[PDB]
Amino acid sequence: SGFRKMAFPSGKVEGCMVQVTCGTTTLNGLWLDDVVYCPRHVICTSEDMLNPNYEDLLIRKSNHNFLVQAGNVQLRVIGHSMQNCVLKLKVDTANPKTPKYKFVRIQPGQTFSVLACYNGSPSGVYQCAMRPNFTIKGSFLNGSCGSVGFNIDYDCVSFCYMHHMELPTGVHAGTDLEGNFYGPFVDRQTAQAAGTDTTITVNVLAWLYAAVINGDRWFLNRFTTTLNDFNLVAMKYNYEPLTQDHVDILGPLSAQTGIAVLDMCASLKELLQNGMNGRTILGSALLEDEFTPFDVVRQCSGVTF
Amino acid sequence: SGFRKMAFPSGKVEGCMVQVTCGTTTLNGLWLDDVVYCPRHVICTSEDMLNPNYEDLLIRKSNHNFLVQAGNVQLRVIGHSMQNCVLKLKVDTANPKTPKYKFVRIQPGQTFSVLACYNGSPSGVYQCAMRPNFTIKGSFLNGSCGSVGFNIDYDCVSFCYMHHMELPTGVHAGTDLEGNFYGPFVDRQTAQAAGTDTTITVNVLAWLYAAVINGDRWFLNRFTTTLNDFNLVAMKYNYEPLTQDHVDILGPLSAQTGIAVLDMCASLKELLQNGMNGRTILGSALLEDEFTPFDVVRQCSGVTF
Ligand SMILES: *[C@@H](CC(=O)OCC)[C@H](C[C@@H]1CCNC1=O)NC(=O)[C@@H](CC(=O)[C@@H](NC(=O)c1cc(C)on1)C(C)C)Cc1ccc(F)cc1
Ligand SMILES: *[C@@H](CC(=O)OCC)[C@H](C[C@@H]1CCNC1=O)NC(=O)[C@@H](CC(=O)[C@@H](NC(=O)c1cc(C)on1)C(C)C)Cc1ccc(F)cc1
Incomplete structure (x- = not known):
């Protein structure tokens, strides 16, 4: 008996967690096969947050500026592509622990677990829901981006969310693993009000x-x-x-x-x-x-x- | 910002989770080095639950009655010892994924994550506290025993709890990994009332x-x-x-x-x-x-x- 805010086991997502340093800024990335995914604001600092020009940033940037680390082993970036507000970093090696996975864009109301990480290391796991106004009530600090949300089916991990931002309201906004933001939010330090939330x-x-x-x-x-x-x-x-x-x-x-x-x-x-x-x-x-x-x-x- | 019922990442405990079949009854066990730990009621059925005689049960039982499984690979029991209400099953192989671990007996008030499992496979992870009356408000069903609670320090997993029983009140009772029950509870289907809980x-x-x-x-x-x-x-x-x-x-x-x-x-x-x-x-x-x-x-x- 009993009922608790149960989260999915996180082991399979723990194995895919890396840290991504481009310049001084460091965040987290998802290491799947021979590509590492991560937010595209790793190529800009807080100075640029006001209104960043992501396309001039990656244009004037090579695969050596991107330093992917996996514990101690560093990875060598061979190519870098920008899919919306996510960054695909093609690396020479392929993650041995890449689980059966998939990328889904969940709907408002659906829940998912979150594995909050910093410096590519996991701090904890908790459960969230995509609110009817495409926000989530998460628990994130500076250096948490790259942290991902997911569902499970036996062995197929369904990645649905990557963390990008926190609105001054305390709520949080992000994208799918395809780089498209949930709701009308865009990664720049600009006042953007979420709709009036509702009860599910x-x-x-x-x-x-x-x-x-x-x-x-x-x-x-x-x-x-x-x-x-x-x-x-x-x-x-x-x-x-x-x-x-x-x-x-x-x-x-x-x-x-x-x-x-x-x-x-x-x-x-x-x-x-x-x-x-x-x-x-x-x-x-x-x-x-x-x-x-x-x-x-x-x-x-x-x-x- | 934000605050959630955060649980520790479960990967390191996922790797140590096995299922233990003695007769028809099956439950979960913790596979650490060359020993598997599990509740001692795996050698008795619900028929015996009323007031089991655990010592006559293991006496008339060999290491072939114990069938440990780890996914598909079965393990061979070489010895079996009874430490209080836990059962130490010495097996030929040693778990390759055994993490830096330790066994601690937490105090009333302390919290810990729980990785609820069935048939040696993990369903979910959530956060609990040892109540001042040595119960916990968990979320367990039939076939959940062997499920363990733990804390973490970088890489040292501190196992503190193994799940044994559920009191008719809906609360739950268990032991440390040394087999000693928290509070005055003993593994038998006998009315045992917990004290009056208090707020921490x-x-x-x-x-x-x-x-x-x-x-x-x-x-x-x-x-x-x-x-x-x-x-x-x-x-x-x-x-x-x-x-x-x-x-x-x-x-x-x-x-x-x-x-x-x-x-x-x-x-x-x-x-x-x-x-x-x-x-x-x-x-x-x-x-x-x-x-x-x-x-x-x-x-x-x-x-x-
Ligand atoms: C994640 C970025 C990171 O890991 O490195 C630290 C800079 C971070 C998450 C928030 C930090 C504080 N708590 C969080 O959850 N995201 C940012 O810092 C982005 C800027 C913001 O989130 C600010 N809010 C807004 O810009 C905003 C957006 C809207 C629609 O309304 N207001 C808060 C910090 C005030 C910038 C960023 C940096 C690096 C990334 F990989 C993604 C995004
Ligand atoms: C775990 C046993 C298992 O995994 O196999 C199923 C038999 C199970 C946990 C409870 C089942 C229902 N939800 C739970 O959380 N434990 C048991 O079935 C034990 C019997 C009980 O827990 C009963 N309660 C009492 O006996 C009791 C104790 C006190 C102090 O007051 N009442 C409930 C089921 C009513 C028996 C058991 C079997 C196998 C084990 F490995 C450990 C314990």
Whole structure:
């Protein structure tokens, strides 16, 4: 029993972590086959952060300016290409520990683990979600870029995120491993406001199923609701609308607990309108919205990798 | 910026994870050098759980009954010894990936990461604390025993916990890697009540420093308090007493933020007496007590491994 902010095991990503020094600035890179990926701001300093010209920087730069290190072994860069806001550094050697991997661009709502690193060495691992406004509530310091987020399927690591920036709001912004930023953010020290975040309704419901599975059942009421009426209330509390595709993704939790999704929606409707009155659900006094229906299943059923 | 339930990277523990089949029952084991450690209830079934006689079980059992597997490679047991409630299985081969390790018995209040595994394969990693009543709020299912908790220092993995049982209360109990149970628990299906848990005061204060470092500062008031008067109030709300050793462990956070510990104690005194009034601190509507002063430092300063 129990429910925790579970992250995927990080060993397979630990083996692919390098540090990348171009000039004085140093950051992290992902070493896959004979290419190292890393943010493209490794070729500019904080002096250039204001509004960098990345194309003049790499133009006037050779493969010797790039010093990749893997513990103690240094790597020799043979070519360097710029795919959007990421930098592909083709190196002579290929990482022996390159796992079965893939590059995916996740959607708002989906979760992923993060392996925070500095100087190409990993500090810790934690779980995050891509917010509806394409930000994440991470935990990063100076020298954390290159740190990546990922999902797993047995042995296929699905890289989905590379860390680039932190908005003055405390939130964080990044790209996929193809260099395209999530949301309307671009790597330069310019004021860019993220949209108004919203609560991930489907994830709140999956979290409520997890509570039921674990014994917390005081919030279950006797009612049902239509999908529209629920959405009418949720709309007031800045909750994302619940589509039928979300209802279908909860089918398994619904089937497993014997609680129809729309009855659970009725339980949540009351929680939003009346609050929790100082009670807790799975040890939290707030409604949690960073657990997907799959995250609950893999944790309450125990899928391994 | 940011603050998350950060866990240590799990790669080095992933490499030491095996599955151990004695009869039909299968669980997990820790493969270090030429010995595999695992709970001693692998030689008894649920039928025996009521009150097992572990010494008659291993007596009438040979090294062929023990089938250790490491992915696909099976291992050959040469000897088997019973150290308290753990089982030492001496095998012919030695784990090539055995990291610099050590076995420590942590104290109540200390935290550690957990790598939850099933069938010798890792599902996920999360962070826990040894409660003042020698339980932990984990996330374990059937077939999770053998799963271990640990801390790290650069490259020295400090194994501190192996998972054995779950009390009907939902909490969990285990042993150190020397087979001695934390608290008054013994591996048998017998009603055993844990003490009344308490809040880890020192950790709540460290968490409050972390909030200040991250911008949440509304709870800071203008007062100071004596150590005794604080303890008098904290005593009422089931908070552990704050010793001078705890005050000294907060010195660094105190020095870094410029807030004296006893003034922070005054801020917490108000939070307990008046509550938070629907506000949050680092995204939580409750006071969190599973972060040590070191856990904050390593995360807000960025120590790597
Ligand atoms: C990562 C860069 C690194 O590893 O080397 C240190 C310079 C760093 C992450 C943030 C640092 C502080 N905590 C973080 O999470 N990124 C940067 O320093 C970039 C600049 C910023 O992030 C600033 N914010 C903005 O520019 C901004 C963007 C928007 C839309 O609104 N404001 C904060 C530091 C204030 C620059 C950079 C440097 C090197 C890289 F590889 C990527 C990006
Ligand atoms: C781990 C055993 C395993 O991996 O194989 C499955 C039998 C398992 C962990 C719990 C299972 C359910 N969720 C868990 O976290 N441990 C057990 O099954 C042991 C029996 C129990 O834990 C029961 N609780 C008690 O016995 C108890 C103890 C006290 C002080 O109060 N109540 C729960 C299942 C109800 C038996 C066991 C089997 C194999 C092992 F290697 C260790 C322990």
